Structures are given as structure tokens and as C-alpha cells.
Symmetry: D2
Subunit: 494 residues, 4 copies
């Protein structure tokens, strides 16, 4: 069932969302928003700056004050509001998926069946945690009653990437709100639109004003304002490792706000000679090519044992040669455009090093079409470890395939990167599955699969791929602040 | 390193232990204690009855009173006392292992290297939980502050089996004391001695009087007194499923005391054709023959895929034919006696059905020696499911080996019992390991091993093999009683 | 907002619910169901017996089989089904509240505003736990990978009381289903009707057939069948302590099925001289008189410090003299009838001992009306501890008020009962609040309030008031069965 | 019992500790270490630099490698090593307390009875967690088996302050080692000595080489090397908020290493008119004057309700006038010196603003003695909020006392700081205790006490007083790195 919108899409929500009302930018300036597939302007959106971030934080700060409706309402009712928001997003599933496909260059079937289903499901998961966040009672030494409160932190700045605008909006706001925080959200400059629609739905659902504020605009302007703000308690960011470093620096120099980062990767797969070959090819393929290669977990280094390497490469190239490039919205189309020019350029430049540095180009290797930021799906075999394409996150439809003979050595190669977001292990051997996945320095390790993400699981990076975890029981910790209360008593009893 | 006691062992502690002092039985009666390997009396021990159980409970009840030293001491200090007790048992390791070997018919190497090492390690594990037992603070609906206390339950009656007297004493008292309970312990009539020594060490370590009381004697007398007592809050029992039913009945009819039971099993292994054959033979063998077959987890039904069945049986019989029967204390001896006549008889009677009902007797099948309750190690192949030896817990050195062709069907056969304590799965296939172990109705499932027990793991039965779990984080729950405290407040804030 | 049903109520659902279809009793026999307020027959309902319990268990057993839709569906989808069921009950709130009021003699405002709101809220709470039930990974000694599964137990027999038919149905089925169990439910003989409606809604919501089965009928027939059944894994019961003992006995004698009991109480309040007097009077009053005194937590012994005792009694009597007895359905009416004749009789007989044994009767003390099981609200002062009304659970609108001078002594009196479900402490002193609530042998202790129950809190009894806890995080444990899986590995790494 | 060392103390350990051997600095340079009470050189210690930090990290990195003894040993054995280390520190309690008193200017009774008792107890607490750190098994959507490993992070850089050298060494190394990390420790330049002794005891206890490495030297040299190091996974620091900001900046700019900070405070107490006056005076006094005022939790703003303010100040001044200044080692002496000149100067300069800005000087207000960094205990009343002494952390023996009439307003004043480490609330009113402690933006809130710290409790700051928590169950999270493993399976069952 892939249903579509009967009527053409209208853009309605284009303004800054503060205290559940729509504001013009303080400057009165606006910025254009484009369709990556056509390069055509879709609309203009109010451009947020430091000055508008300041109005947004004051609102969030006020909504967080002791005695406010958001602080005093039952935790179960915070949960209710989140499940209501999920019902509303479900109601507008067609609209939101179309806007996502059109604004983000995302295949409509994926937008409809995966992104929107993931938004709704993650929101419902998070709603369920709200009244299940608990502290402890603790048998402290001495005559004292000690307990802990796992309080909300406060005003959380949240910077959302362009690759999954809806899903990452919900990954951020779901846990933050479930825990009782207020938020100031900065959607990606490329993709502000679906966040602004969701904001209209946060108002409709009845969240108190100031609990969620959305400020579109640029990273170097509105993003830096958030990251350096003296009354924002925490920043959450997903994006490049480079910008990740700036945020952590800015937090340190400003007010020591808490920081969680989900950054890039150069995620490896190790395919043992005993693996289900077809299964490893299929998962490794979709693992690196999903959403035009624009996933932080891109399986961008595939290590295959020598005796099956040739056969793996062949089957891989075959699968890569089956795509149909075009408008995300057209049925049958199986690959959309890259998000924008900056990205488009870096990917072509990286594809060019592949050749110069002397990888074996099996298919693809250039642009496609007359308009839109389309890159041909590309496969390099015989890649080696000092090559740019083997070290640098491409964030493009470009697969690297290498050979290995020694398991000891391939694990060292797999781990020999500053990244560490994810990895895959393909084998039928129980002992190898357990021991290899233990030895990989990666936040998520898939065995005989790839790219399996769900709300029930914590997700995040080792090393420079990130700090902290999102989702699962564990992810919920990073939106709480623990307070210990210790009360003098005449005499304790166990 | 198997060191031994330089001097002959002296029996010192033979009396009822209450309030850290030694008491004669109220009747003044005594009962004999024997060496299973010689049938010779070792000593006389004071015989505990209802009347002595009553003195023991009053002491435990008094030691549990609000404001007592055990109730008011720091949880960390309960932990200290437990780690001290472990240091003391370590000091007397040679003595205790010898007494265990001599009184329980247990091989000295196993007693020294396994039982005593397990006592010490489990005690130290439990000591570490004492100040880490925590309640919660809870975001209740309405204007209320709600917290929970995970209190000790109170006076816990604990009936210890004869097969692992020291280890099961520590399994019971470690968690109970760690949580702040007081205990009345009833060691097995066959094996009171090592418990009485440990009691001398509980006094030495400085536990407050009445926190641990030990009352030797019989099950139908002192056991029934415990199980029916109106001021005992909980009963823990390990033993036969038959007696297990009586305890639960008696608890219901008396004061609805809490009940945890660890009972027998008829635990199955499923060996797939792809398994490491030598490894499965070795683990399945030791799995059923450990401590003269006298383990509740005895791997007493081994299902082997047809194409490796003949080879499995052969290798099995070979291993079973390597034992040396004799005095547990003599070095080189690899199989001791059964614990007593009642047991000895049931095992021979079950071995006799094996033959009549028409299993293939591969080796063993009768008694051994002139004195001592020695049974030849016995192996039956071609066993089928309606046979007594395939349905009834033997608790003797008797292995059953069956064949299967269908995985669906063998799992149904594996699950077709009222027992469910443990199982083993031998295979190299990842999917099968996970899916079979999920489908088995067994409390502990070993994959490519058997009989792996540690303090960090919860342990207990599905179905009529028991109620509740011992050890691990989870086992600690069954020695707490949760109290919710809900306080009216003017206004709550998250 | 107390809205009502525009149209008269029609009874539709009156049959045994198995595999999502309606069955006649195997006997073909039926039993009458009455209105306690009129003594008039409301309808006939199919009478369930052992034979119909057997059909119900086979269905539940089949729905629990490995590979079934209930076993294999995502945990998140079990949660979805539960939130859907809550939406449906919300839709039929008017209908269900009317049926509850009419069948159970329950005040309609309470039924509508409290019982139904509690059903919906508890169901939504439970839905949220479904995909948050987690086992552990454990750092076992040796070279092993060990994890635990917190599996559903299996087929759970659930016996629901008549005092809160809807709320207790949801307390039982919510957690059981959330955890993945299947259930066979036995609603109270007096109050089968609202359960049968909910069953129609379980079918509508799309639970797989056999996941919930409802079998109305009698306790000594269908109840005993459940409690003694050889293929029911667990029994949950709420009711009298007397019947509680029978169930635990029957479980022991049959198949050692797991047992949780929530039984009566004789719950005490301790009111210190420093307490907010009006607040303690109001909470203690509603604490004992709620739902015609028919709560297990009835605050049926109120201990008041001497210097405020006279003033407490006066204010109490005044509040008790304000009721309006009548049909639960009529607006303005503030006290309905007792549930039936058996109950009615025991309450009058207990009121009669109050007089003979020589308490001071302040108001009430006899029946009311010409039809219906109405008892005048009754207040006894100068009650002492050996009086029947001070020892026996009345389960009627009868308040006992006593005096105390010594805090040490009143706590001993408060604790001097075989019951221990709940207690109240009224004081402004921080130290006293904490120390008294610690010293009370009661499962829930309210401070400066009473009768505050919410889904987020575990609830259950100390002593003969019950075994186990319901609701909260902790209550969810008693619907899981823990399985430890231990896998041999070549080498572990931390 | 305050026992002392019979023999004079000898300094033995003065070198850099790497791979359980003693190294000279790579430069060959050394730095002097002083006695704050005499200003006399105690000894010379090897001066660590970037170059020696590099040798220390390579050792820690090697000791962390997959397959090493520290990675492969049982978690229970990591615990054993920690309990052994605690036994050793207990053995050398006299020695270590003397060295602490002499090197750190710390009163010997406090060093012996508090610091050393806290070291031993915290170590034993941490040992107990080692084999109780557990991941989860998770009911992920789809046909997958998902589990998590809570792995050690890796090489942890740990910078220890001078105010509690032993206690903070154990706060850092206890949890880090318990979790399986390796460490590179940088003791304070002022106080390297007791860490070097503990290192000799880490070698004696048998930790594997490279698991703990200690590198003395300066903050701007060895500290910055740690904070900017490209192969250190995490930095933990306790100290000034100013240096705290530099570390977080340096971590961001280098390798995005994880950061936990425990920084200063300007911690407030709120004393209600209903409080136990003597109790609040005593706790607030010791709260600000403990260890010459050199605690991060110094109760450095005491807000007292107007009607008891005069009486509070009087009683306070009286208590402050009872000290005896002198050598920490001399019995009877009740106040030692400040740690050094830099500190001494800042404190006198802050005392000088107190006067100029116009607080009421009640006692003290200048230096003391001819040698040693002694400051007279100082009390300022009538302090207001814009005063330096009311905004700036003094870290000296200087108490500020203010008045308030409005509870709303005093809470705003209490919260009106960038700090937020701790607070105190003194009252007898239950509701106020709960509501005020909820409203305070402080990591630890004491009610009717102050400065109550124990291993069982998490401890750390809100706002610029720190990021993260140390100790308790919760603190253990910040020394783990969570890895999710998701395995494809044919079919899952709940
Ligand atoms: C190859 C191989 O197979 C084996 C099979 C085993 O089978 C067992 O039953 C046991 C005893 C387990 C135990 O500790 N118990 C006391 C606690 C309750 C259960 C019994 C051991 C130690 C065991 C060891 C090995 C080795 C080595
Ligand atoms: C001032 C004041 O006193 C009160 C006293 C009360 O006493 C009760 O017993 C109850 C019923 C609690 C309940 O939900 N039950 C169903 C679940 C099992 C236990 C019974 C309520 C709602 C209650 C409310 C108030 C208010 C308001
Ligand atoms: Cl906590
Ligand atoms: Cl709890
Ligand atoms: Cl578990
Ligand atoms: Cl986790
Ligand atoms: Yb172009
Ligand atoms: Yb004989
Ligand atoms: Yb009548
Ligand atoms: Yb000087």
C-alpha cells in the first residue's frame, strides 16, 4: 500500500514558532528553500538569528519555571500529549511524506513507509517512557533518608540534520519532552519545512506554549547562537564531525552546557567466507546506498574474505546497476538526488580521488541528468586503506569494497579510524559473531544484517562518531539531571 | 594445586545454633550422622524439632525488630560482615572441604576446587549487593511525592539440600543477609556438619546474635515446623518436587508466607548434527554424571540427531568406562558413593526399569563395592519417551541417550515434561542457537556447554522445577518486600 | 462534568468468551445476575464450570505457542493493542460506567469519574511498558556470553473481585498482556457484566484469538478449576484472605503454578497531635467509607492521639451524618448498597458485636430502606484491640476510632494483626513521617493522605494481606519468567 | 581512637608510575613539593610533561587491548583487586593519613578518621559493582535478537584536585577500574605524594601493568597534554570552573573525548524560622569551614529568615571564635593552613572586598602566624547579593550570612548563580522540605544537615558546577560505553 496525496501540496507553515505562535524574524529577513531534484525554489522561510534564538530561549525558560503547567502536569499527561502528537502526524502522513520527499530529495516510498512510520513509532515509544522515568531510594551510610530525582535538565537546544528531517526531529524532541524538558529546535537550513508543520501539530495537540519552539535558519548563525547561549542547559546535534567539534568547543567556552553529538562515520562490514553471500551482498548494498548514501551509518568500507571477494564484487556491481534515477515523487524511481551543491561537489571530488589514487571503478563515477544534484551509483573495488575514499566520509552513493585474508588484521583495519558509529559482521559461526562484534569499536554492531534501527535500541557513536546515546532506555538518561536529596533522620532501619 | 589437611579432621560443632550460642535440643534427643562411603557413624548431632524451631524464630524475630543492630547498621556494614565471612571460610577451606567430602560423599578435588571456591565467590558477590539494593522515586499522578523502600521481608526459613551443603547454604544465606533478613536454617539431615562449622564462623565474624540460627534435624519434623510456622515470613527450599508441593501447601494453610522452591529436573540436551561432537560428548557426560548424578540440573535426556547418534553413543560409553570408584578422599578416585540408602534404592530400581522396559544397556547397571552406596556409572541408549528412566528424575549416575530426526519434534519432546530447570543446545548455527534456546521451556539454557553456574546469573526453574530465581540481580528481589510511601504535597514539579 | 447515557442501557454480552467467539456453557446452564440496590434480576449469564475452563485454557495455551501471532508480534504492537483497547473503553465510558453502577451498586459519579478514568489510565500505562520489558547481559565468570530473557510466563488464571470489577480486570489483564501472556479470566459471580463488554472490545481491537478468554461463573466451581488446573502457569487472585489460602494450597497440590494474591486488610491510621486535623478527618473518613466500605485498604482502625481524640471523633461523626442513601444512578445520592446478602449479613453481625462488646456507637448501627442491601454509615468510638470490629475486616460502612498516648505502643498496636495491606500517618513532623512509615508493616503507607492509588506505583500486601505486587515497574516482574542463556565462547572481553 | 605513627614519616615514592615501574621524567626535570603549614620543601618529585603523558597513554592503551589480561579477566576478579587495594590502604592508614596531613595541610584527625575511612569505604563500594555492570536484552521491532554491552570506554585521563587528594583519587580510579577502564592519573602539583604511595599499593595488589599509571607535574603542562591527547577516550577533572572550561574546549578541539567535570560552587543554605536553630548553626558552620573552607560544596551563602537571623548570627560567630590554629599534626589543633600562596592571596583579596563593599565583619578578617598560609576564620553578616563574597567562590575560611523575609524570593536568590553543586534546607515542615529541595537548582540538596557524602550516592553539579555524576549506581554510567548488537534471526518469540 503506497497511497498518495490526491491534491497538490500547499506550503502553509513558513514562520518562526515561539510560544505556540508564528513570528517574523526580528531582522525581517527571509531565506529561500529549494527542491534538490529540480533546483527550483519551493518557498521563502523566515530567517532566524541570534536575536530570534534569544526570544525562543526566554520562552523555553519561562515554560520550564517551577510551578508552570509543563513542570506541574502529571508525567502521564506529558505522555498523552506525545501520543496525541503521534496520532496527528499519522493523520497528516500523506502530507508530511510528500513535503519530506519534495524538500529533502527523499524517495516517496521510503518517506511514506519508513520515515513517517519511524516518526510515529518513535514518538509512541517515547510517550510510554514519560511516567516511567524514576529515581532511587538509597541505603546511604549513617542516619539519613536519601533519594534521587531524575529531573528534566531544562532548556535543550536541538540541531536537526537534513538527511532525515522528520525522524531526527522526533529522535530529539520525543525523549526531551518525555523527560520534561523544553526545547529550542533548529531544523536544517536545507529542510525546515516538515518541522514547521509538526509545530502546527504541537500547537493542535495542546502542548503548553514555550515547551517547543522551532527556529529555522543557518548553522553559522542560529546554530552558533544556540551552541554558545548562556541560558541553554544542553545542546544536541547530529551532523558532521567537523561542526560537532565546534559545538563542544562553544559549549565549553560559554556556560558548560551539556553536549550530545551524533556525528559521521566510516562504518565497516566484515564478510567472512562462511557467510550467506546473497544476504551479505544485499545488506551491504542497501547499507551504503540508502537515501543516496546520505546516512551517518553508511557501510562505506566492506571487507570481504579473499576466497569470496570476486564473487561478492560481481553480485554487488550487478545490484548497483539496477537503479532508476529521477524525481523522488515519481513511482518506479529508485534513486533521488543528493541534497545540495556543497554535498554534490564533495562527492564528485571524492569519486575523482578514487580514480586518481587508483581504485578499480566497477560502475558509475560521474553526475547524471541536466537538473538536480544526481550522482550515478558508484562502486570501487580493490580499494586500499590510505585512499581518500577509504578514510573520508563521502555521504554519497559510493561503495568501497576491499579484500582481506587475516581476521586479526581486518579487525585492526576496521578499527583503524577516528570514527566508530556502526559496523556489520557476516558469518554463520556463533563464536565469530560474538567475538568480532565485541572487538569492533562501534556503537552499533549488526550481525547478518545492516541498518536495523528501532526506538527500543540505544544508538550512537564510539570515538569521534559521537558522545552519548539516543533512544532506548539508556538514551533517556541524557535528558535527565540527577539530584540527590539527603534528609537527616533520628534513626534509619533497613 | 590440590592441598590437603595435614592433621586428621576433628568434629567440633554438633549443636543447635541460636543467638550465637550452642543449645541442646529441647527434647535432649540426638541423631546419628554417617559417612556414605563407609556406612560408619561420624558423630551424633542435636536433633531439632518444632520446639527448637520456635526458639530459633523468636531469636530471628527479635533480631529483625525495628531499632535492632541488624536493622539499624549501615547496609555497607552488612556487606562487610558477609565479606568477612567469606575470608573466614577461605581460611578454613581445607577443613570445610574435608568435612564436605567425608559427610557428603563428595570427591575432595571437587569439594576443594569447586564447592569451596563457589561458596567464597558467591558470598563475595552477595556482600557487594548489600548497599546497592535500592527502591525508586516515582512520578505518580497528582500532587504527591511517592517513593519505594525495598525492605527485607523478615524471618526467612531456609531448607538446604544434601547434594551441595555448603554451596546451597551460601546461596540461601548470602542474598537473605545481604538484603537485611534474619534466617532460620535447616540443613539436610544427612549433612548438618559443614553448616554448623559455618555458624561458628558467623559468630566469629561478628554478625549480631539471632541474625543466623541453624537447626539441624529431620525434614518431616523440623522442616514441617518451618514450613507451617505462623511467624516465619518466607520459606526457601531446594529438593524434590514432591516435598516442594508439601511446603507450598503448608505455607498456604498456615500464614501465607512467601515461598521460593528450587526442585528437580529432567533436563534435556539437543545435539545437532553440525555440533562439535567431542565438545557435546564431554559436556553432556559431565552434565549427567557430576557429583554421582546428584544434581537437580542432571542432563538426563540427551537427544542426538540420527546421523551422529551412533558415534555420540560410542564416545559417550568410552568416557563412562574411565571412572575409578572409591573413597572421595583418596587421590585419583573419580567417583564417590550415592548419599544414602533411600537414594541408592530408588536409583537401582530405576536402572531395573531401564532393562525391563527395554533400553540398550551400554555399560554399568548394578551396585559396586562391599560397603558404601556405590552405583556403577550407567549408560542406556535407544531410550524412548514413555520409559521411567526418561520421565523420572533418577538423581544417580545414569545417562539416557535418544535419537531424533526432526528438530520441530525433538523440541516438543524436550518440552514434554512437568520439569523445566535447565537444557543444553549443541550447534554451530547462530540462528538455531538463538531460536532453540528461546523455544525451550527451561530456566537456564546452555549453548555449546553445560552446568555453567555462577553468582552473577539468576538460576531457577520453569514449571514444576521451581518458583522464583536465586542469585544474580534478579534473585535478590525475592528477599525484599516493597513498600510504597506516598506523601501529600502542596505542588509537585517534575 | 458528569455526563450520562441518553438512552436506557441494554445488556448485550452474556456469554463465555473463548477464541474471540461467544460460547454457551458446556452444561447449558445459566446463572442470574442482580442489581444490589433493587434485588431485581438484571439478566442471566452462561455459567462456567471446570469443563468451560478447560476449553478456555486450551485456547490460551494454543495462543501462547511458539510461532503464534501473539508470540511473534512486535512488543510495540502488543502495546498498540492495549492503547487501542483503552481508546475503546474511553469510547464506551458512559455505557461501561452505567453497567458498573447498576451491576455493582457503585455510585455513578465515582464509576464515571474514578473507576473508568482509572481503567483507561492504567491500560495506557501498561501499554507503555510492553516494549520496555528487558533482560540483561551479564559478566559471568569464565569464557561465556550470558544473557537473560524476561519471557512471558504463559497461561495466567486471573480471578477478579466484585468491588472494582473494571479496574481489577484492567489491573490483571494490562500487565499480563503487556508482558506477552495469555489469560483465562474469572470475573466475580456478582459482577460478570462489564468484563464481558470489555471482551467484545478486545475482539474489536484485534487481539489474536485466545489471548484473552473470559469465563463467568462461581468461585467454588470455575475458580477452583483455575486454581487447580494442571496447564495454567500462574494464578492471580484478589479477594478474601480465607479464599486466598485455598488458592495457594490448590496451586501447591496441583502443578506448583505461580501465585499472586491481593487479599484483605485491617489497615490502620495513626494521627499525631500535631497533624492537620481537618485533613486527617477528611482522609480517614473517605479512607474507611469509600465504595460503602468495600475496599481492601479500608482505614478500619484510626488511632488518634489523646489530646485531639475527642475533637477528631466529633468532626468524624459530623461528616458521617451527611450521607444520602439511594440508587447509585440518581444524582445527589452519596451512598449505595452493599454488594449482596452474604456481605450484608456479615456487616450487620459485626456491627452487633461492636455494641455487645461495648464500643461507643456514635451514629448508624442498623440497616436502611425496604429493598437493597443498604447499611447505615456507622461510627464506633472507644474501640479497643480485642474487639471483633478491631480485628475482623468488616468490608462495610463502619469506622472504628481509638485513642493512644504512646507512639511506641500505637505502632505495636498498628502492627499487631496478620494483615498488612496499607496504613496512614498524619503529622507535620518530618522525622516522624519517615520513621513511622518505615516501622509500619504495610505495603503502602500514606502520609497526610489516604487511598492514593496510581498505575505508576506498586501495590500489594505485607503478611496475610497478599503475596507480590501489582502495577508500577515492580509489578511487571510477576508476569515474567526469567531464562538465563549461557553460551560458550573462545574468549570474552569486558 | 586517634592512633598515630610511632616512627617519623619517610618519603619513598617520588617517581612517575607507568606499567607498574618507576620512571624518571623524559626531560630529567624535577619539581619541589611543600608543607603548607611550614612553607618548607618536603621533597622533589619527577616532573611529568606531554612526553611522559605519551608514555603513560601508550601503556594504558596497550593494557586495554582486546585479549589483554585486564580485558579478559573475570569482572569478579577486577572487584577482587579493588577490595585488595582497599585492604592495603587500610594497612597503611597511619602512613597515608600522615602524608595527607603533612602534604595537604589537612587536620590529622580528619585525615585519619574521615579521608582515609572514605577512601577505604568508597573503594570497597566500587569493588562490589564490578560484576554487577550489566547491559540489556531488548524486544526490538522485527525478527532480530538485540542486546547491549556496557563496555569500558578505554583510556581515561583523570585530573585530581589538591583539597582531597586520596579521596578524589579513589573517586576517580574506583569506578573507572571497576568498569574495566585503564587510567592515566594526574595528581595535583601541590599534592602528588599520597597518589604515588597508592601506586606502590596498586603494584602490590597485582593489577596488571598499564591499568593504572600516575604522572605527577603541573596542570598547564601534563594536564593540558591529557585534555588534548588524541588517544585518550575520556577526561575526568575536579577543580575550578575556569579550568573546567579549558578542558571541555580542548576535548572538543582534539578528539571529542568524553568529559566529566566536578567544579566549584557557591552553595546556599536556606534556614526557615521553624528550623532546629542549634542544628542549622552547627551544620551551616561546619558546612562552610570544613578543611579550611576548601570544599567545592562550601555552604558559602547562608540565608536565614529575619526573625531568627540575629540569633543565628550570634551563635555562628561564637562557634567560629573557638578554633585553634596550628600544625595539622599537633593534637588539639582545629584549623590548618590554606594549601598555597595563590589560594591564600585570592582569599585575602576577597576578604578585603567584603569590607570595602560593606559587609559587617563579625570576627576574623586577616592572616595568622609567621609561617604557613593561615587565614583567620572569618564571618560576614549583612551580606548582599551583588557583593564579591556573595558571588565568587572563596575556597577559604569565610562565612557569609544574609537575611530573607520571603520564601519565593530567597529561592530565586539561592538559584541566581551560574553554580549549582549543592544546597541545604533547614525546616521542620514536611511540605517545605520537599517543595524547596525540588525547586533548588543544585545537584545535592541536604535537609536538616550538610556535607553528607557517601559512596552510595551520586554526586555532581547542576549548571557550571559540573557535567555528569560520580559514584552511586548512576555515576558508574559515565565510565561505560554502550554497544548495541543486533542479530538477524529467522523468527523471534517474546
Ligand atoms: C566439560 C565440563 O562439563 C561439566 C559439567 C558440569 O556439570 C555440573 O553439573 C557442574 C556443577 C554445577 C554446580 O556448580 N552446581 C552447584 C549449583 C547448583 C547446580 C550444580 C559442573 C561444575 C560441571 C563442570 C563441567 C566441565 C568443566
Ligand atoms: C479526601 C479524600 O479521601 C479519599 C479516600 C479515598 O479512599 C479510597 O479508598 C479510594 C479508592 C482507591 C482506589 O482507587 N481503589 C481501587 C484500587 C484498589 C483500592 C481501591 C479513593 C479514590 C479515595 C479518594 C479520596 C479523597 C479525594
Ligand atoms: Cl540515581
Ligand atoms: Cl519499586
Ligand atoms: Cl535478569
Ligand atoms: Cl542499554
Ligand atoms: Yb548544473
Ligand atoms: Yb549392603
Ligand atoms: Yb429484606
Ligand atoms: Yb609570608
Amino acid at each position: 500500500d503506497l497511497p498518495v496525496l490526491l491534491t497538490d501540496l500547499k506550503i502553509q507553515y513558513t514562520k518562526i514558532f515561539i510560544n505556540n505562535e508564528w513570528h517574523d524574524s526580528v531582522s525581517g529577513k527571509k531565506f529561500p528553500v529549494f527542491n534538490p531534484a529540480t533546483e527550483e525554489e519551493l518557498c521563502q522561510v523566515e530567517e532566524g538569528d541570534k536575536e530570534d534564538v534569544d526570544k525562543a530561549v526566554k520562552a523555553a525558560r519561562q515554560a520550564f519555571q517551577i510551578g508552570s503547567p509543563w513542570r506541574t502536569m502529571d508525567a502521564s499527561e506529558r505522555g498523552r500529549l506525545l501520543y496525541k502528537l503521534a496520532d496527528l502526524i499519522e493523520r497528516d502522513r500523506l502530507l508530511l511524506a510528500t513535503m519530506e520527499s519534495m524538500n529533502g530529495g527523499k524517495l516517496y516510498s521510503n518517506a511514506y513507509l519508513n520515515d513517517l512510520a519511524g516518526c510515529i513509532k518513535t514518538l509512541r515509544y517515547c510517550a510510554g517512557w514519560a511516567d516511567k522515568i524514576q529515581g532511587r531510594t538509597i541505603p546511604i551510610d549513617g542516619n539519613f533518608f536519601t533519594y534521587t530525582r531524575h529531573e528534566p535538565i531544562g532548556v535543550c537546544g536541538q540541531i536537526i540534520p537534513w538527511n532525515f528531517p522528520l525522524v531526527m526531529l522526533i529522535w530529539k524532541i520525543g525523549p526531551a519532552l518525555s523527560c520534561g524538558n523544553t526545547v529550542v529546535v533548529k531544523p536544517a537550513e536545507q529542510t525546515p519545512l516538515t518541522a514547521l508543520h509538526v509545530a502546527s501539530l504541537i500547537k493542535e495537540a495542546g502542548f503548553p506554549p514555550g515547551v517547543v519552539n522551532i527556529v529555522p535558519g543557518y548553522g553559522p548563525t542560529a546554530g552558533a547562537a544556540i551552541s554558545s547561549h548562556m541560558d541553554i542547559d544542553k545542546v544536541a546535534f547530529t551532523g558532521s564531525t567537523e561542526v560537532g567539534k565546534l559545538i563542544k568547543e562553544a559549549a565549553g567556552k560559554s556556560n558548560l552546557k551539556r553536549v550530545t553529538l551524533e556525528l559521521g562515520g566510516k562504518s565497516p562490514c566484515i564478510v567472512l567466507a562462511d557467510a550467506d553471500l546473497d544476504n551479505a551482498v544485499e545488506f551491504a548494498h542497501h547499507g551504503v546506498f540508502y537515501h543516496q548514501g546520505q546516512c551517518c551509518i553508511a557501510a562505506s568500507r566492506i571487507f570481504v574474505e579473499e576466497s569470496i571477494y570476486d564473487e561478492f564484487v560481481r553480485r554487488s556491481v550487478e545490484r548497483a546497476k539496477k537503479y532508476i534515477l529521477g524525481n523522488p515523487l515519481t513511482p518506479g524511481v529508485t534513486q533521488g538526488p543528493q541534497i545540495d551543491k556543497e554535498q554534490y561537489d564533495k562527492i564528485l571530488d571524492l569519486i575523482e580521488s578514487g580514480k586518481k589514487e587508483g581504485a578499480k571503478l566497477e560502475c558509475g563515477g560521474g553526475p547524471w541528468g541536466n537538473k538536480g544534484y544526481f550522482v550515478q551509483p558508484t562502486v570501487f573495488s580493490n580499494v586500499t586503506d590510505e585512499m581518500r575514499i577509504a578514510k573520508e566520509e563521502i555521504f554519497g552513493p559510493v561503495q568501497q569494497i576491499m579484500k582481506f585474508k587475516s581476521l586479526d588484521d581486518v579487525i585492526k583495519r576496521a578499527n583503524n579510524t577516528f570514527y566508530g558509529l556502526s559496523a556489520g559482521v557476516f558469518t554463520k559461526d556463533i563464536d565469530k559473531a560474538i567475538t568480532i562484534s565485541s572487538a569492533l569499536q562501534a556503537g552499533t554492531v549488526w550481525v547478518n544484517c545492516y541498518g536495523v534501527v528501532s526506538a527500543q535500541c540505544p544508538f550512537g557513536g564510539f570515538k569521534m562518531s559521537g558522545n552519548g546515546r539516543e533512544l532506548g532506555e539508556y538514551g533517556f538518561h541524557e535528558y535527565t539531571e540527577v539530584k540527590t536529596v539527603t534528609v537527616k533522620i533520628s534513626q534509619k532501619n533497613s
